[PDB]
Amino acid sequence: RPDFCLEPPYTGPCKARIIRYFYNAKAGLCQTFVGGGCRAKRNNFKSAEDCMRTCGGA
């Protein structure tokens, strides 16, 4: 099945500027990005720890 950890970060339509984490397979690490506040996909974490636990090594 498609690995959600490999999907590009999705800010979404909402206009908040919340700092979230996504797994960047190209860099091999969890990076920060702007979450709009709604319609979040799964490669969107509240912390680096959550991101690494879920997507580390993808």
Partner: protein, 223 residues
């Protein structure tokens, strides 16, 4: 705010910044103890920053007050984005004067074509990213429900309205959510969502505050 202008220090006294270790949303002060924002702006440990201009520097007119209550509309739908409104109670009453003041709630809904003032510390670029230090402002008209639905088929509810310019270039953007859309001295909207920012044929969508006046008043009074 994309395609706007520098408001000027404290020229929008009801505009507040929601902070969770950094600025993430805006809000509108409706009285000394209450702020109106968007439901999707619900976050943990919110600190309301009033009297702000330069969001990155302490200028001397700021009032940092923690949220004691953050009440999301009981009918907020995180999928459709319907009922995107939240009321925040300040742990201590804010000191009101010229620099920190409340904005009146509407007595009636606004009509298409009505010019309004939209403000915030959100992204100033339609393509790319650039966040301002000082508060940005934008004059934009409320658009018809018909045009709004045409722009966003099957997505506009009775509690949303579009505002902006169809040609693109002027709009609210990430970081502006929860902020004000004031028309004739009344808070008619809350920055909510849109397809990107300042894109042609894609005006910003806002929570229709006039539909929640009774709920706002009763909720504030019961908390």
């Amino acid at each position: 705010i994309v395609g706007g202008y520098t408001c000027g220090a404290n020229t929008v006294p009801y505009q507040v910044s929601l902070n969770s270790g950094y600025h993430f949303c805006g809000g509108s002060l409706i009285n000394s103890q209450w702020v109106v924002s968007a439901a999707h702006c619900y976050k943990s440990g919110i600190q309301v920053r009033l009297g702000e201009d330069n969001i990155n520097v302490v200028e001397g007119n700021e009032q940092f007050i923690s949220a004691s209550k953050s009440i999301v509309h009981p009918s907020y739908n995180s999928n459709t984005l319907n009922n995107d409104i939240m009321l925040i109670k300040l742990k201590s009453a804010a000191s009101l004067x010229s620099r920190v003041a409340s904005i009146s709630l509407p007595t009636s809904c606004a009509s298409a074509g009505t010019q309004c003032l939209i403000s915030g510390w959100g992204n100033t670029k339609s393509s790319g990213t650039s966040y301002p230090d000082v508060l940005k402002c934008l004059k934009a008209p409320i658009l018809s429900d018909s045009s709004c639905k045409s722009a966003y088929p099957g997505q506009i509810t009775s509690n949303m309205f579009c505002a902006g310019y169809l040609e693109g270039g002027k709009d609210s953007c990430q970081g502006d959510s929860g902020g004000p859309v004031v028309c004739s001295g009344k808070l008619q909207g809350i920055v909510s969502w849109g397809s990107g920012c300042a894109q042609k044929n894609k005006p910003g969508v806002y929570t229709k505050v006039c539909n929640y006046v009774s709920w706002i008043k009763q909720t504030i009074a019961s908390n």
